[PDB]
Amino acid sequence: LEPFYVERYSWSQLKKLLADTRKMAKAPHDFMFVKRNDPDGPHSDRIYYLAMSGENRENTLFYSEIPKTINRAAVLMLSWKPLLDLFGIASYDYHQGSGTFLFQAGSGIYHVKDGGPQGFTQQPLRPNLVETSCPNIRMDPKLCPADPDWIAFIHSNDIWISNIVTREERRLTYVHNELANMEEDARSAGVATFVLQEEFDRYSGYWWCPKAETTPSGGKILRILYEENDESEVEIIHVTSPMLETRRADSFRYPKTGTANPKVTFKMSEIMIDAEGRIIDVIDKELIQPFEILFEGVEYIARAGWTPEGKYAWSILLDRSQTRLQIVLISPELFIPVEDDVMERQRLIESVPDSVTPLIIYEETTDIWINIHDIFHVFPQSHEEEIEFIFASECKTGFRHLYKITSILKESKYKRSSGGLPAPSDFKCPIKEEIAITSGEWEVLGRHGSNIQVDEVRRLVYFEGTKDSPLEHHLYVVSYVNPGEVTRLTDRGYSHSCCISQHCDFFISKYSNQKNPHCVSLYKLSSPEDDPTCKTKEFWATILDSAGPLPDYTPPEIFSFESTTGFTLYGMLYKPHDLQPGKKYPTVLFIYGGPQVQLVNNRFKGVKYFRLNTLASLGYVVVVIDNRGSCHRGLKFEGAFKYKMGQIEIDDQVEGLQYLASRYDFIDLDRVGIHGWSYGGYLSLMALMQRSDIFRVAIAGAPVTLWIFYDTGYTERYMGHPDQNEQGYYLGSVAMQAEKFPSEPNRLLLLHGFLDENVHFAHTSILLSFLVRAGKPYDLQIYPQERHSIRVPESGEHYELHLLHYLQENLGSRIAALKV
Amino acid sequence: LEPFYVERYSWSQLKKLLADTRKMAKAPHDFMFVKRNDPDGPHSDRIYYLAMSGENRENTLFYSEIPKTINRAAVLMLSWKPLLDLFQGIASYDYHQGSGTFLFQAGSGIYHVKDGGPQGFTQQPLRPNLVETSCPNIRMDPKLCPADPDWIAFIHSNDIWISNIVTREERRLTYVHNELANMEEDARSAGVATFVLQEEFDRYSGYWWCPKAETTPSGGKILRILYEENDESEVEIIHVTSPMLETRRADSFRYPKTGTANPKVTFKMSEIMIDAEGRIIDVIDKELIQPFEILFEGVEYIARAGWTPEGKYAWSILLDRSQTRLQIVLISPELFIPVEDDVMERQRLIESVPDSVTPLIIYEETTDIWINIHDIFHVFPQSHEEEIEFIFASECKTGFRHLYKITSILKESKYKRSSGGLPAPSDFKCPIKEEIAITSGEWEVLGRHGSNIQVDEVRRLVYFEGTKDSPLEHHLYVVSYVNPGEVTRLTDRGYSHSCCISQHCDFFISKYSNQKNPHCVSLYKLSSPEDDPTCKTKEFWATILDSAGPLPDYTPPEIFSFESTTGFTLYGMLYKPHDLQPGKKYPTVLFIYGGPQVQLVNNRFKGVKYFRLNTLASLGYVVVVIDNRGSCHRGLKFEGAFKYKMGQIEIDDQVEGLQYLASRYDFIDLDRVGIHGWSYGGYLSLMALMQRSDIFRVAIAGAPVTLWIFYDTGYTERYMGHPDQNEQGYYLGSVAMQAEKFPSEPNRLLLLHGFLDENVHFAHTSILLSFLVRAGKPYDLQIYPQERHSIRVPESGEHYELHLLHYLQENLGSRIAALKV
Ligand SMILES: O=C1CCN1c1cccc(CN2CCN(Cc3ccc(Br)cc3)CC2)c1
Ligand SMILES: O=C1CCN1c1cccc(CN2CCN(Cc3ccc(Br)cc3)CC2)c1
Ligand SMILES: [Cl-]
Ligand SMILES: [Cl-]
Ligand SMILES: [Cl-]
Ligand SMILES: [Cl-]
Ligand SMILES: [Cl-]
Ligand SMILES: [Cl-]
Ligand code: NA
Ligand code: NA
Q1: Per its UniProt record, what Pfam families does this chain match (chain A)?
Q2: Residue B238 to residue A248, Cβ atoms within 8 A
């Protein structure tokens, strides 16, 4: 077995090779189905969606016509009709009754009507700019669902509202002064703080009440539930600003693990409008008792909203350890006006009855961790003293499943008149019913756009899941009344990302597999006459057609092996291009390995991981293995590294690498490299530190070197509080074990974005500080204008060029063998 | 000629080699002579001085006895007597002659002792006496009051305080700064030199005691302190990462970048009334009768300041922004009035001051190149009321720094303040009665880095350091200031000397060395023949610090020189490879600084600071160092070569010098030349690779200036002018704007930078990297996370030396480096 050596290209030649092979647009998303209601016309629905028409284009609203019938011999490509004519849209709001779109595009907030009482346009609409007296950028605009004339938005960390008809603009909260410095004033209203956006994927912090309360005057009362945050006690850090000419650093509140999270509470803005759209008064209201007293043990407001009738506000609440979840109904009557006069304040507390109380309709615990998701459906309230809902959970079985729950809304044992504090279980509602809708060794999905859609007429629930395979997401449907058979609606051989129409007669799937790039197709749903419970599907039309299998991309093979740990572990193998018999090639292991991610699945990897194919063309074996802790395999699989991050991941990587090495003689174990970003860069350092016998080179991108520097929401979920896991934090932090790195140079390469807000450069800078003390060699590349991503394409081109060149000169080439 | 390939040591082996070969203390300095006045005793003087006793000991005060006579057959070694006892690191000290009071800071504490005064001379170590305080924070810059040695002054939280060391009274004089408030709002200070003044003009203090006390009718006195008051509110704020990397933070400070605002400055005076028993009566803070901008037209920087010997006038040396105009100005105490926010009382105090009292610009000069500030300025005792007599040094006349005796007429000004108009530029200018050149020639007098003059007013002589015999050696000279002609050299040739003359002018001490021999310190007695007091001879008296001798692990370089095509003789240093094999050519490593205010090539011992150039020679590298045009100690025309043109002329001299050696010596392999330097040296290392990639294979740039707009006002504008008036000078001189010119070959560029550098900020490197990334160019990078323009932690220095040797090995010297292309 002779060693294969890669072609030793120059720096200029590699740049040219990369540029030639480099020669993606956002696929259609955020779908919405509006009915035509026109018996004579040829179309049943109009679908609205966001997309990028090409690579250089901006993301904008489009529409397409869904025909009542189709020529089944042919295939129908729906044409993309532009909705707007502006002189970049991330999301949009819509009001069904009026047909009013509301969206932000650049600095402006705009509105237009389509598909309401005023009909359907046949050409692009010029949008109407919403007026404002506010100087700064307006964020997070939302239509009031009870009245489409009123919008809300955030400006300088305070909630405003504006009327698009009458032009009245009113500030609702006076919590932040923009002029003063952020050290004194660190309060905000209606905005999710850093940890909740970054680690819980909640981006909004205020919620319109869906219904208006009519007054005796002839006007009405609109309500806004919102989060008020106080970040005064949260640690401040200084990250370097993008304007490098201005040699300065921007401040922001980063709650590092162990330290204080923001001080949180619920508030409610009660807005009185008169008979013809004019504001009478705005009453800001607060909880009758403090947040800490009413919600014992709660750190995080994970999710929040309203019930369909607007009777209760709801919220999903977590404790600090993220092992307890509570779903709590909060009545508007629990809020009283904000008064500083102590005599007047005491009367308002007495005016609220003792029967009005927080209602904990669901509670659960786990020894592993609670994974927050977006699934939560509340049914219409039939009985006054009951509430019925669907929720998803891993806590019963260790796999996420849908459960139909009915909770009794008791009057509480605790009485506020006595003047005491409520015990832990005083607000807990008894569970009348708890039926499992789904079950098995597979999970229902509720993240990254995956959710349920409930058909209340047919009494069905649509959902995404891993039932047929952990490598493919599929759409399913099942009854929530007499749950039993789970009917798969998507075709095997692809992994699907689905969106179901609100009318439950259509669904769209964005699908791909290892060989075929992404397609988006529309499918019509229908039942047999004899049984509404049964659901069949039929292909209706293509929205986005694939270009076909790319001629200059060879996809990998998915393999698997039975681990000594007890689990089946899956991997991807890129064989070298033009594989010579009786020769062994250098091997680059690409890794992420952290939680909430799965690299190995049946999806098209030729866009995001296109350069793994490029490595194979140069003559590298490329391997990707999903170790224990990774996503879509249940909570027991995911819980393997609890309190133990860094300690088990590389065992699975080496085990899988040795499985391939014995089964394929062309893998040269003497020249194995490892590379990854974020958690991947972390594990790449751990790989070289723990197993220098296996791994010759390690290229660590944006590595977490020191877990005390990372945030609360993430780190405490998987590693607990630093005091309760002294050893896990030490053993899991590579910066603390600098002496264990090799004394040989050309084995360690550190890559980091200089302006990184998530994984700060200090992780690298402190690692380097200890590497200097330990007398250890290292290589370093900095990307001075990057923030945990590739904003500027030149820095991405330079990264790719350097990595190929580094792997060439220190792993693959003939010179690399001579250099040792 | 075969190429020599250096031995390919591993990383662990080079660490061992450097650890073994690594196996210094401050030599005696800040000397002072005090006479015994004891006829029966054997000693004439006692010398006090600061010195480090050994390798790992603190810097502290010592004394030695100077005997009246010596055995001229023998060589006397003076023993070091410790002045101070061990406490329950002294950088400098004050002394008061009439009382014998020492004052000095040692750690946080300010201490005092007494010796050599009326109370006599100790024969054992004195216990230091702490100056007690109620101030919460570290006290800075303590100074004895020359008028009354009971009083001291110091800075605390950017304000001036005074403390009586006998009565223990303590008082704050200025209320300009608020320690509790943040620096964005409160950017004012008093008695403190700001960043640019400390870093670019070597002024470390911002307040000056008046040396005489005005007596009152009551039987008390008035003490006075002149001080600078700075307002840094409009100055650019920058954030450098704090030493504590645990808290992901950056410390703010005021950095006036080129072309932006310097601090708003003015003179103030604290009038301090003391009663008959040493108690403070009152403190009156006082300000200039008109603003600083009105009285001192065109002035940006207060370069130097102080008082005349009688305390009649305060003086100051003032520069304009371009640094092409110097002004020496006398400022009377009567120009200051008390601070009064009341509008009617303020107007009455202005009217009480006469119109005759006015600023007195006793000297002015200009230049098309630049003003180099120095510490030479000597005011004689005032004989006539309408005259002032003084010695000063300048390059403005001839282009070399020389001493000039000047007499200026103190004219009552034409401008009158009662008219209510602003003065014209020349209204405060004094006429020059006399301007006699004391020295002259194609060589300079030295007035910086400790070099100054000693003026014997009895014999009417002036001692000074200069470059008359050679630009490669510093020497002590003496000459009359009445009838200047003969310049007598006092120090011996073959060494470069650094000298301190006694206040009595009958002794001098010289710290001397040469390329072959380490540093010595020796005492020399001065005397004259009875017939001619002008004629000065010297005689070795005693050794203070004996040399360790030429240690066996260091082979020093040979000083060479070549006649350049530019018309200047350019000097250099050459380290030949150790065990030089015949018929072989070795890889070369050019070490460079090449910026202004520095000379690397001279006849001094280089085996301490540049020990590792010898280590590079031992591994088999040729090491070259060349003082290009712009460097120090060769006159102002030589220095002015790169005005507006930094980065453009320096590498021509480096390559020309390299090619001189290449023709003269066949052992220099021009195919394998490396370049390396720190600061301006790192800047030129980049420029060398950028411009002459044909000559230089590798460049190792340390803390490089990559963008001149990022560097401060005082330095950049002196050499390059204002950015607006020299757009292409700044462009051509900034490597970050010319990133496309770097090589596409990797393993040729290595950047080194201290992450916490406050002088040449890491931003220089990060913005260079920004443009290198855009241009698609390769680079190597090493950061030192806990360093700031120096090596304070030994581990970072050890890592630097290891990586540098290994980099040169793997990408220049070794056999594998040749195959790697
Ligand atoms: O911070 C910063 C600065 C850049 N960056 C950052 C951080 C996290 C993720 C990503 C995006 N991944 C980059 C790596 N990609 C695979 C890949 C393998 C081999 C080769 Br060759 C090229 C690409 C997947 C996407 C970038
Ligand atoms: O910033 C920073 C961080 C370090 N640093 C900095 C900046 C300016 C000056 C100096 C001190 N010089 C360091 C280099 N020395 C010659 C030398 C050549 C080869 C070898 Br190998 C070792 C030493 C002379 C003294 C250090
Ligand atoms: Cl079931
Ligand atoms: Cl129902
Ligand atoms: Cl000694
Ligand atoms: Cl003369
Ligand atoms: Cl005289
Ligand atoms: Cl010019
Ligand atoms: Na996110
Ligand atoms: Na200095």
Answers
A1: Dpp_8_9_N, DPPIV_N, Peptidase_S9
A2: yes
Name residues with Cβ closer than 5 Å to ligand 5, which is an ion: B 80
List B189, B502, B618, B679, catalytic entry? B679
Q: Assign residue A106 a region: left if phi > 0, alpha if psi is -120 to 50, beta otherwise?
A: left
**Site of tokens 């590792």:** B612
DSSP string covering A398-433: SS-EEEEEEEE-PPPS--GGG--PPPTTTTBPPEEE
Buried b (16+ CB within 10 A) or exposed e, B446-479: bbeeebbbbbbeeeebbbbbbbbeebbbbbbbbb
d(CA B38, CA A523): 116
Query: How far, CA to CA in Å, does B796 sit from each of A256, A739, A768, B142?
Result: 29, 15, 11, 33
Nearest to A327 by CA among A340, A336, A314, A342: A314
Q: Which helix (H) or strand (E) holds A695?
A: strand A695-701
Q: Which of B549, B297, B217, B249 is nearest to A249 (CA)?
A: B249
Would you call A140 a catalytic residue per the annotation? Answer: no
Contact predicate A626/A572, CB 8 Å? no
Residue A460 to residues A386, A452, A527, Cα–Cα distance (Å): 21, 10, 12
Helices (H), B303-459: 343-352
Report the amino acid identity of residue B716.
T
> Nearest Cα to A558, choosing from A603, A594, A495?
A603
CATH class of B29-545: mainly beta
Structure tokens at B481: 């200031």
3-class DSSP state of A460: strand
What the block records as the tokens of A234 is 């949260």
- Measured between alpha carbons, how far is B33 from B501 in angstroms, rounded to an integer? 9
How far is it, in rounded angstroms, from Cα A207 to Cα A204? 8
- Token look-up 């000559």 returns B695
- Looking at CA atoms only, how far is residue B178 from chain A in angstroms? 18
Phi and psi torsions of B561, nearest 5°: -155, 155
Query: DSSP string of B588-617?
Result: EEEE----TT----SSS--TTTTHHHHHHH
Q: What is the DSSP string of B297-311?
A: TTEEEEEEEEE-TTS
* Encoded tokens for A389: 């809902």
For β-strands A695-701 and A667-677, DSSP reports them as parallel
Indicate if the alpha-carbon torsion angle A637, A643, A649, A651 is positive or negative: negative
Can you tell me the distance from the alpha carbon of A729 to that of A708, in angstroms, rounded to the nearest whole number? Answer: 8
For A155, phi and psi rounded to 5 degrees? -145, 120
B114/chain A closest Cα distance in angstroms: 45
3-state secondary structure at position A766? helix
The fold of A29-544 is Methanol Dehydrogenase; Chain A (2.140.10)
3-state secondary structure of A323: coil
* Token pair listed for A819: 């250099």
Nearest-angstrom CA–CA distance, A363 and A476: 27
d(CA B782, CA B203): 33
Q: Give the H or E element holding residue A772.
A: helix A762-773
Sequence-separated (6 or more) residues with CB below 8 Å from residue B223: B145, B147, B148, B151, B209, B210, B213, B272, B274
Nearest to B223 by CA among B261, B303, B279: B279
What's the resolution in A? Answer: 2.7
Whether the CB of B678 sits within 6 Å of ligand 2: yes
Residue pair A386/A407 in contact (Cβ under 8 Å)? The answer is yes
Can you say whether the dihedral through the CA atoms of B288, B293, B294, B295 is positive or negative? positive
Query: What is the DSSP secondary structure assignment for residue B411, as one 8-state letter?
Result: P
Does B275 qualify as catalytic in the annotation?
A: no
Residue B578 · residue B618 · CB < 8 Å: yes
Distances from the Cα of A25 to the Cα of A51, A60, A281, A791, angstroms = 8, 12, 47, 15
